[model samples]
Target chain A: LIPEIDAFLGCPTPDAWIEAALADQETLLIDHKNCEFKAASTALSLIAKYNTHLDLINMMSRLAREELVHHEQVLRLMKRRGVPLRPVSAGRYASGLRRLVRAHEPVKLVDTLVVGAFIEARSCERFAALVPHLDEELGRFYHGLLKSEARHYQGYLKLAHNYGDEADIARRVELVRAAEMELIQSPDQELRFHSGIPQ
Target chain B: SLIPEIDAFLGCPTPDAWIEAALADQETLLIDHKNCEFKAASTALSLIAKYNTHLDLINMMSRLAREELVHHEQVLRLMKRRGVPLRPVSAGRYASGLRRLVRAHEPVKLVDTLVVGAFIEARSCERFAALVPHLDEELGRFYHGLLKSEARHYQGYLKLAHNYGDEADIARRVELVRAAEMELIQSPDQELRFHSGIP
Candidate 1:
C-alpha cells in the first residue's frame, strides 16, 4: 500500500477484495466508471446547496471536471474492449458514509467533505493495489488515475479544513472512517468495484 | 442550418453590437466563455447528484458534463494561444433572474430548476449560432462546432423536466421563467458576460 494513501484512509483494502475485483474485470471497470460519475455528481451537488463557500466551490468545480474526464477515459477503454455500457446499481459504500452526515450547516458541509476525502483516498489506494495485479493495459490505466485521485483526496481534506475546526473535522472523519472500514471489510452478497469481501 | 430549432427555443437573439463588442474584446469573451462552460458542467453535475433516482436524467447530465468540460478545455486552449489571462468576472443577471423564480418546494423545485437549465442552454446555443457568422475564421469554425452539443444540452434539460411529470404545470412554469429570462436578455447591463443582456 502507498504510505500516503494509507495515511489518508482508515484501513487498507484487503487482498481478498482485490482478488475478487480481478476475477470480474467487466464489473470492476463498469463500477469504477460509475464511481467516477458519482464523484463528479457529489462535487456538483455540494455546489448546488452549499455554494456560499467560494473556495470549496472552486475546488469542487475543478474536481468535477477532472472526475468526468476520468469517466470518459473509462468509457473509451470499455468501448475499445467491446464492452457494452449498461447501467449498474450504485454500491453502498457512499450511502453508508452519507447517512452519517449531520443535518445542520457548517457541520453538514464539513462532514460531507470529510466523507469525500475518504472516498477518494480509498479509490486511490484501490487503484494502486489493482495496478500490480491486472494486465498491462488495465494496470497502466489505473496507474494513470492515481495522481488525480490523490489530488482529489487532498482537495476534499483541504476544503474540510476551511469549513470547520480541525479537531472536530478529524473526529467526524474518524466516525465516517470507521463506517467506511466496516462497509469495505464486511462480506457483501453482491460484488461491486467498491464492494467488500465477496460472500 | 443552425438557427431553426435554436431560434425557436430561445426568446431573444444575440444582438449584432454584442458580437462586435465580443470580437473587439476577445479577452473578456474567451474568459467568460470558458467559465460558462465550467459552470454548465457544474450545473449538470448538481442535477445528476441530487436527482439520482432518475436514470435517464443521470445518464444525460453525466454525458453533458463531459462534453462541457471538453469545451472548457478547448476554450482554455484558445485563450492560451491568444495570450488571454483567465480571471474572475462578475456574474450576469440572466441565470440569477431565472434562479430566483425557482419554487422553494421537491418536485416543483426540480421541475423549475430543470426549466431554468433548459433556458440557459438554449440561450447559449442560440447565441453561439448567431455569433458564428461574425467571428474570425478559426473562432467562427470553433463556435459552429459547439452548436450541436449546446442544442443537445438544451433538449436534454427540457426532456428531463418533462419526464418528471406535471407536464402542464412544468410548461406553465417554463413560460414564466422564460419571460424573466427574456427581460434579463433584453435589458441593458454593465457586464458583458457570455450570457449577459444588451449593454
Candidate 2:
C-alpha cells in the first residue's frame, strides 16, 4: 500500500515526524481537518477563477466534493475520540509551494495545478506513512483516504497537461517539488500536520 | 418538501414569466443553473476565506462549496444530455446588486457578506423549487434533490452571520440586501439567469 505512494512522493516523510504527530494527536487531527477544508477551498477557488475549461471544471468540482467528504469524516472521527476540532494556522508547507506560482494567466493556472499535484501527492504519501504508526481505526481511516488523494494528484496533473506547455509545466512542477521537499525535510520552528521535520 | 421554508426565506417570488421562459429555453436554463452553482460555491469560498477566522465557518463553507460544485456538474450533465453546447455568459445584475451593498468594514463586511450568501442561496432554492413543477420528470427530481442542500446552505449562512455579529445589525443588513435583491429580481431584464429579473 505504501510502496506506490512512497515512489510517488519526491521524499518520504521522516519517521521522527510521525512520532511527534502521534505524541500530539490533538494538533495532528486539528490540522488534518483544516487541511481537508483547505483542499476543498483550493479546488473551489480554481473553479471560481478559471471555469472556461469544461473538463477542468468537472475534475475540480469532483475533487472538491470528495475533499469535503473527507473533511466531514475527519471531523466525525475527532468527535468520536472526544477531541474538539480547532483552528490551526496554515503551515509553511503549502504556502512555500504556492509562492512558486507565476503571476500571469495561463501560466499561473498551470503553476497552480502543478502545485496542487504536489500537495495531493504529499498528502497521499503522508497518510500512508502515518497509518502503520497509528491505532487500527485511525489507520483504516487514513487507508480509506489513499485512493481519492491519489486520484486528486493525477487529476491535477492531467489538467496541467491539458492546460499548459509540457516543458514549462514540468519545470514549474520541479520548482514547487523542490520547495515542498525543503518544507518537509528542514528543521521546523512549528509543529503542524505538514510542517518541517520535528525537533 | 422544503419549498415553503425557502419561499418564506426569500424576499421575492419567482415570477411566472421567468418560469415560462425557462421551460421554453431549457438549454439556457441548464447553463444558467450550472453557472449559478459555480458562482454560489465561489462566493461562499471567497467570503469564508476572506473574512472568517472560525474553523466552523470554514467547515460549513467547505461542505457548501462541495454541494454546489456537485450540483454544478449535475446541471452540466443535464445540458450535455440535451445537446446544449456550453457557452460563457457574463455575470448578471442579480448578484452584483446585493454585492454592491456589502459594507467595506470588518465585522460589517463579514456580516453583510454572509447575509448576501443567505439571500443568494435562498433565491436559488426558491427558483429551483419553482422550476421543478415545470421541468421534465428526471430534471424535476434532480431539482428537488438540490433543494435540501441549498436550504441548509442558506440556513448555515444566516446562522453564521448571527453567530459572528450583533443579530440586530445582521437583521438590518439582511433587510437592506433583500431590498436590493428584490429590486434586481423584479426589474425588467434582457438576459435570463438562474437568479435574473423577470424578463
Candidate 3:
C-alpha cells in the first residue's frame, strides 16, 4: 500500500553485487541514455490509443513532452560521463511482466497502467535509494530524478484510477501487485541492474 | 537593423517563407524527434532490466509518434490561433548536417537516430533557455515550462546513444554532434526558430 520505497532502498546489495549492478547500470543507464524516449513515447502511445477522451488527451499530451525531456536528461548525463556509445544486450523486463497481462478490455488497459505505476514507483524509489550512496552531484541528480519518477508513478496510477472506480482499481491493483512482486522477486537468468539479487 | 530591432522587439519574424517551411517540416521532425526520445527511455529501461532487445525501441517508437503528433497538434493550434497558415517548406539545415554523419546500417541507424535525437532535444533546450527571457509573457511561460522535459529528453538520447554504440563510437559521436550542434546554434541564419542557429 505504501509502495515500499524503503524496501528497495534497503537492498544492501553487496558492493560486489553493487559493482555488477553498477556495471549493469553503466551498460544500461550508462550506455542507454536514449531509453527514456521509449518510456514517454510508450506512455504517449497509450494516450493515442485512448485519444477520443478529451481529458485523457490533454493530460497524456502534457505528460509525453515531460517524458521526452526526461529522455534528454539521461542523455545529458551519458554525454558527461563520456561512456562509449556501444550496443549492449537488452533483457526482458517488460515482457516478463507482460506475461501475466490480463486478457480483456478496460481491464487490460487498467492492468497495464497499474503495472506502469509500479515500474515508475520502483525507479523512483531506487533513484532515491541511490542518492545517499552517490557523490554530491550524482546525489542531487538522482534526487531530481526522484521528483519526476514519483510524479510519473502518480500519473500512471492516476490514469488507472480515472479509468475505473475505486473498487475496481483496488481489486485490479492487488492482482497486479502480486504479479509485479513475483517478477521482481523471481530468479532472472540475466544479471541486470534490476534483476533479482543475481541468483 | 530590422533584424536587430526585431531581435530587440519581438524580433523580425523569421522570413515568412522560412516560417512556413519550418512549421511544415516540423510536423515530421517533431514526430520523429518524439519517437527518438521515447526510444531512449524504453532502451534505458531494457538496459536497466539487463535486456536490450529492440522491442522496446519499437514499442517506444510507436508511443513517441503519438506524442509528436500531439505536439504537432499543439503547434498547429498555436499557428491557427495566431492565424499562421500551414504550408510545406524545406527541412532545416541542421538535421541534414547531422544525418550526413549518421550511420547507414540497421542497428547503427537506431543509435544514430538516438544520438541525433539528443542533439535535437539539447538544441531545443539550449534555444528555449536562451529565448525564454526574450519572449512575451505567455510564450515565455510556455518555453520555461518546457525546460524540464527538454532536459530529460536530452538525457535519454545520450544514454541510448551510449548504450547502443561502442566506446569509441560514443566518444566520437558526442564530440562530433556537440560541434555540429554548436555550429547550428551559433551560426547566423536569416530564419529564426527554436533551433535555427544563433542569427
On lDDT, the leading prediction is 2
- lDDT score, candidate 3: 0.58
Regions more than 4 Å wrong, model 3:
A1-19, A23-25, A31-34, B1-70, B73-199
For model 3, chain A alone compared with the true chain A gives a TM-score of 0.82
Listed models, DockQ each: 0.19, 0.47, 0.06
Greater lDDT among 1 and 3 belongs to 1
Number of clashing residue pairs, candidate 3: 67
Which RMSD does model 1 reach against the true structure? 7.5
- lDDT (Cα, tens digit) per residue for candidate 2, span B1-199: 2223666666789889888877888877777778888877776677655744556776777677777787788888887787888777777787788889999988688788888988888887888888898778998998899887778878888888888888678767876887888889888899877788888
User: Model 1's DockQ?
Assistant: 0.19
lDDT of 1 by residue, B48-159 (tens): 6677556577667777887786787688668768777656665666778889999988878988998898888888888888888777899989988888777887887787
Name the best candidate (by DockQ). 2
Q: Runs in model 2 with CA error above 4 Å? A: A1-4, A103-107, A164-173, B1-11, B16-28, B46-60, B99-115, B129-178
Which lDDT value does model 3 have at B52?
Answer: 34
Candidate 1 whole-model C-alpha lDDT, 0 to 1: 0.79
**Per-residue lDDT of model 3, residues B1-199, tens digit only:** 2111112212122333433444455444333333343334344343333333353453454444544445445654554465544333334576667768777776666677677777676656655565555456765676586666667666766666666677676666666766776666556776534446534
True contacts kept of 2: 0.55
Q: TM-score of each model's B chain?
A: 0.92, 0.92, 0.66
> By TM-score, highest first, what's the ranking?
2, 1, 3
TM-score of each: 0.64, 0.81, 0.52
For each candidate, the alpha-carbon lDDT, in order, equals 0.79, 0.80, 0.58
